[PDB]
């Protein structure tokens, strides 16, 4: 109930910072959140914001992180991570032609850890950590998925 | 009217079903005479084997009492 409402409200109030830390960590060569339209493992082989990817890839890159954060709040209000895992079950096959999967998994890890930073770990810090861990767990393998 | 009491195992070798496939891989069930042939052919078609057949219900004389 009201705990879940407060948890999702706390994510929504500063969702920008959570995406910002992950984007700045995995994207080097500029400011990733200048490309966000809201303003309007060997982990990283850091893509350059203009050289390797380009603007059209950059917009998808910035959008999908905020989309992931939004669906986490969706499942948080929901009872289970079904909305998450049904949407990240076969996602890497779509992504991997233009995806650094190892780059994205470390971004998800940073997102989970930063979201845990916000809360006091009553049950809230473990809840968001468990929900975001579902995305990474269902994403990695490339063969247990789909 | 008579039901054969048999036991058999039938493995599925083309689909690898993933839920409660233990009650469907070995069974004993009374099957009528009129349906026993078509039921027994299914086990052989699937690839399993029948372990035993027992007439159970009736007599081997047949003649009257066969119909049902």
């Amino acid at each position: 109930g009201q705990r879940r409402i407060a948890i999702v409200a706390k994510l929504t109030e500063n969702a920008e910072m959570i995406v910002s830390r992950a984007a700045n960590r995995i994207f080097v060569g500029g400011s990733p959140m200048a490309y966000s339209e809201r303003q309007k493992v060997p982990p990283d082989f850091e893509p350059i914001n203009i050289a390797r990817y380009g603007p059209e890839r950059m917009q998808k890159s910035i959008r999908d992180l905020d989309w992931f954060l939004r669906y986490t709040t969706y499942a948080i209000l929901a009872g289970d991570p079904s909305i998450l895992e049904a949407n990240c079950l076969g996602l890497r096959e779509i992504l991997e032609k233009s995806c650094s999967i190892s780059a994205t998994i470390v971004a998800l890890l940073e997102m989970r850890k930063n979201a845990a930073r916000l809360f006091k770990d009553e049950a809230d810090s473990k809840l968001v950590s468990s929900y975001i861990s579902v995305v990474i767990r269902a994403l990695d393998a490339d063969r247990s998925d789909a | 009217s008579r039901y054969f009491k048999v036991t058999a195992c039938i493995p599925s070798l083309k689909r690898v079903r993933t839920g409660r496939e233990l009650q469907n891989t070995f069974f004993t069930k009374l099957v009528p005479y009129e349906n026993w042939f078509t039921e027994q052919q299914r086990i052989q078609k699937a690839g399993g084997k029948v372990l035993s057949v027992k007439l159970f219900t009736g007599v081997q004389g047949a003649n009257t009492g066969v119909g049902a």
Partner: protein
């Protein structure tokens, strides 16, 4: 028989026998003596009916007793008369039974497959049964004629 059919129906319904079901038994047991008399008459005249049925069959369907036709030889004709006697015995069984399930479980199920394997003319066998029915009507009374003709027409319809 009627008892077997009624008991089977009530057993399938999971209940004791219905008011039609009991009265069908009382009427059958009331008719039993005349059933036995008709059976006694047919059994006593069993050879004459078979002979006249064979005569009428071979006079109405000569193609069977022609070259080919599965009834050319003397042994083949004897076998055909034996089959007519078998169906007469089945009719006598059914009359005393009161229903036709004993006939169906013995000589009516698979008859098409067997006669197609042998290539015997099933319409010819039906004609023989019709001749047997005519002989029985000639050698019986009226009400007994109707009662036996019910089973004879059942055999004719089953061979169809």
């Amino acid at each position: 028989s009627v008892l077997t059919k009624a008991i089977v129906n009530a057993d399938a319904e999971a209940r004791y026998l219905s008011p039609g079901e009991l009265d069908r038994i009382k009427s059958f047991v009331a008719s039993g003596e005349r059933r036995l008399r008709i059976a006694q008459t047919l059994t006593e005249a069993r050879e004459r009916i078979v002979k006249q049925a064979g005569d009428q069959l071979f006079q109405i369907r000569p193609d069977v007793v022609s070259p080919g036709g599965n009834a050319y030889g003397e042994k083949m004709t004897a076998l055909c008369l034996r089959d007519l006697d078998y169906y007469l015995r089945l009719v006598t069984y059914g009359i005393v039974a009161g229903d036709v399930t004993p006939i169906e479980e013995i000589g009516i199920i698979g008859v098409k497959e067997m006669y197609n394997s042998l290539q015997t003319p099933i319409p010819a066998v039906a004609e023989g049964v019709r001749a047997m029915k005519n002989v029985a009507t000639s050698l019986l009374s009226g009400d007994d004629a109707a009662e036996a003709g019910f089973y004879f027409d059942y055999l004719v319809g089953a061979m169809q």
